[PDB]
Amino acid sequence: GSGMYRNFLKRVIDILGALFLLILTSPIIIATAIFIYFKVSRDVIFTQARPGLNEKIFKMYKFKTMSDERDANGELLPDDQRLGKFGKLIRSLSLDELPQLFNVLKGDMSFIGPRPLLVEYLPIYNETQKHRHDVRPGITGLAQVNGRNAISWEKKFEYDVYYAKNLSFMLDVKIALMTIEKVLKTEKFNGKN
Numbered sequence: 001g002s003g004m005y006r007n008f009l010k011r012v013i014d015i016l017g018a019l020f021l022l023i024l025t026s027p028i029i030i031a032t033a034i035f036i037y038f039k040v041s042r043d044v045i046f047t048q049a050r051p052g053l054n055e056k057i058f059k060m061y062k063f064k065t066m067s068d069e070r071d072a073n074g075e076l077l078p079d080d081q082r083l084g085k086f087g088k089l090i091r092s093l094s095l096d097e098l099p100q101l102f103n104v105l106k107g108d109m110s111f112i113g114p115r116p117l118l119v120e121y122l123p124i125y126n127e128t129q130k131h132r133h134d135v136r137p138g139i140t141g142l143a144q145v146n147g148r149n150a151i152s153w154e155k156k157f158e159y160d161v162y163y164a165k166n167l168s169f170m171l172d173v174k175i176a177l178m179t180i181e182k183v184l185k186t187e188k189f190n191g192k193n
């Protein structure tokens with residue numbers, strides 16, 4: 001509600017962590033940007049408009065992995081050829097997700113929180129599920145680690161509202177412990193799925 005973690009510490013940890021991981025992965029960030037510039041597209045970064053804290057829209061950064069080659073007809077060539085071989089390798093290693101660390105540093109996102117979903121889901125949320133945006137979206141979160149017993153979207157949102165209601169340092173540490181434990185490694189919200 002008004003503790004010093006929800007109103008101060010969590011943001012400070014987000015800033016220190018995003019800054020550290022940006023420096024820690026900076027050679028990979030520069031290398032990935034160089035390859036994409038010469039092999040994929042000279043516009044290295046593209047943004048994804050997503051609703052964030054208080055449903056405020058932000059630009060979620062991501063590396064481009066597909067080309068802009070269309071058919072003279074005007075339509076873009078399918079993903080079959082537009083995704084180079086290295087494009088898969090960048091995707092499989094989630095290297096294109098590294099710019100999201102900057103969204104965390106910007107305050108657009110947190111290290112822990114609900115997943116930033118499509119802007120089309122805003123009218124579909126019910127008044128209970130809309131509380132999922134009472135906190136910053138996260139790279140990981142409570143619903144993300146509970147992907148085994150939550151195949152439906154309403155179960156993931158129940159974890160989202162529960163997280164925004166009970167946001168504490170101990171809950172974040174718990175979510176972080178379960179995320180490491182993931183050492184072991186489609187429908188689209190319709191209002192009833």
Ligand SMILES: [Mg+2]
Pocket residue numbers: 090091092093094095096097
């Ligand atoms: Mg990826």
